[PDB]
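Hi W., the chloride ion complex you wanted:
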Amino acid sequence: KVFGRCELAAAMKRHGLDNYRGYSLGNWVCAAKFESNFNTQATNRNTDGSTDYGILQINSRWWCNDGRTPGSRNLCNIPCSALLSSDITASVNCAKKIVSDGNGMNAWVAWRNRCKGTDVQAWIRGCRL
Ligand SMILES: [Cl-]
Ligand SMILES: [Cl-]
Ligand SMILES: [Pt+2]
Ligand SMILES: [Pt+2]
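Structure:
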């Protein structure tokens, strides 16, 4: 599913990503935009034989398992395909653990390069929340 910008923001709000670990909702919307372009089915492989999954591009080296990646630990205790669903609950839950893992949102490359330090408030404009 391809989300609308405020549509995704509403869902993220409900699951409480707004201001989670000190990151305002706009950060999380911006992250999703530049990681997956609001597409829950987005998948991208990188050169360590692993794939980033879903709306927030969670990597299978540590967080989820595809049976495809070496030395995978699956710290979110969930198949990587659960992060592909139209329902973002699986991704948000796992994301909360990731952002708490001693790096904040720096775990997400696209966020660090295209969202961090910017007026993230813009990503929730026009939204009724
Ligand atoms: Cl919850
Ligand atoms: Cl809305
Ligand atoms: Pt809306
Ligand atoms: Pt939730």
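The first helix runs from residue 5 to 14.

W.
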